[PDB]
Design a protein around this ligand. Structure first.
Ligand SMILES: N[C@@H](Cn1c2c(c(=O)[nH]c1=O)CSC2)C(=O)O
Ligand SMILES: N[C@@H](Cn1c2c(c(=O)[nH]c1=O)CSC2)C(=O)O
Ligand SMILES: [Cl-]
Ligand SMILES: [Cl-]
Lengths: 262, 262
């Protein structure tokens, strides 16, 4: 069985995957840039395969519909054989681990609070005790699911708040959440994964801040279909890249080396 | 094939596994206490197996002799079938991943610097540039191997320093390293995993401090023999315990709830 080009599924999400400014002049994988573009190339180099970057059709990370039992997002593309590997800020979770294979984490993170500078909030407990400062999450993904499924008193109270708050505290994209923080004069706080919070804190106009400790401790993993032979090699590649210091260099490149906030 | 009692290998290392003060009055698993004792019980409860805690014979975590190609430590006990699972502060590394299976991490950590309070050191770079303040690691394990194998200029210089420094800067146990920091009047700094550094910082006589950022970003994993059926279940149990908040509660219990330094 001859080797085939590996189909990678990913998602447009700065700074992980972005279309280059001059992408119309380019073709194939060269149209894209970012942390996960660089990571894909490093993994392919170490493992010795050719690959094609593709963008997940439905714009989702991965969840199972309770009624149809169908998996959507990048997880679904792996489950149904439409892609060979997912390389994205994809959180390792129990229900996802049951249906796909994950590498050991290439990045550690946790849920965190983004505020407009000057907002009198220091913690999740602070948020949970009040309603003047509205707060919410993406309307899809592991951050929302954290609150929806939590049995911890503070986070379950926060979820009950989010479901019943008006106007809706949910956002469709990271950009919408960040924009809402920036335009709401301190009256909206955004719950999001800490590494995204850190990235935005170093972007103009430098008006946001990460506050408080993380609410949990999770990781992003490279995902493959359950039992795929590619899985073992890619996991070893992640560990090698981490042990060589290259993952730390990649985060510095896309987060801090060109930070815009001094 | 009837079920059998699961043989767990672990290692005496505070606060992960300790013999209880009254252990002579007790028997079996009840002789022991600590973070990994509690974790083993939680994993066994979720997975529905009985188990026996045993202490690794050679007191090592796991490495392969370059000449004989024999694996020692807890990794060796798994490789050669002497134990079914290792539950310990065992770092997930590439060479270990090649021969045993690892769960996703139950704890995140990195190499860090422990100083006696008042030592004029803030970073690994600070240490690397001088010799008046001696510095070293355990004489076995992943922290030592980090320096021995590093191709990063600062850490390779530190390793060349450690090999050639007199008297020997290596220690046999965590307790020896901590004691050496405490007795050396600021002239010894100890390189060790960050969660151990954090634990000791909250122990009397409250004379040590963790300084600087971590040098790397790694995780501890539950280990099983390659291909063991127990591996999948235990990995799902780790993810469940993390998602329920129980791993965070376990760290707080053994690190901070009874911290001795205010
Ligand atoms: N990592 C999440 C998706 N996701 C992401 C971000 C966030 O803040 N929350 C969230 O749930 C910033 S990049 C992706 C998942 O795998 O579902
Ligand atoms: N986790 C290491 C062993 N190990 C440990 C500690 C440390 O500081 N360095 C180190 O290498 C404090 S508990 C165990 C390993 O798996 O080899
Ligand atoms: Cl092809
Ligand atoms: Cl038995």
């Amino acid at each position: 069985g001859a080797n085939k080009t590996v189909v990678v599924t990913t998602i447009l999400e700065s700074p992980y995957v972005m279309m280059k400014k001059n992408h119309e002049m380019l073709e194939g994988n060269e149209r894209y840039e970012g942390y996960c573009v660089d990571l894909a190339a490093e993994i392919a180099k170490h493992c010795g395969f050719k690959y094609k970057l593709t963008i997940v059709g439905d714009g989702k990370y991965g969840a199972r519909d309770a009624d149809t039992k169908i998996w959507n997002g990048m997880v679904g593309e792996l489950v149904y054989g439409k892609a060979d590997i997912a390389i994205a800020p994809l959180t390792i979770t129990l229900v996802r681990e049951e249906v796909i294979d994950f590498s050991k984490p290439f990045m550690s993170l946790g849920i965190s609070i983004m505020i407009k500078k000057g907002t009198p909030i220091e913690s999740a407990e602070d948020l949970s005790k009040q309603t003047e400062i509205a707060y919410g999450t993406l309307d899809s993904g592991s951050t929302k699911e954290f609150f929806r499924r939590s049995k911890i008193a503070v986070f379950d109270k926060m979820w009950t708040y989010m479901r019943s708050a008006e106007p809706s505290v949910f956002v469709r994209t990271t950009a919408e959440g960040v924009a809402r923080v920036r335009k709401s004069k301190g009256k909206y706080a955004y719950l999001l994964e800490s590494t995204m919070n850190e990235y935005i804190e170093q972007r103009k106009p430098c008006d946001t801040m990460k506050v408080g400790g993380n609410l949990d401790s999770k990781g992003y993993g490279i995902a493959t279909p359950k039992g795929s032979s590619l899985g073992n090699a890619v996991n070893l590649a992640v560990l090698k890249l981490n042990e060589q210091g290259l993952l730390d260099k990649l985060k510095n490149k896309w987060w801090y080396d060109k930070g815009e906030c001094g």
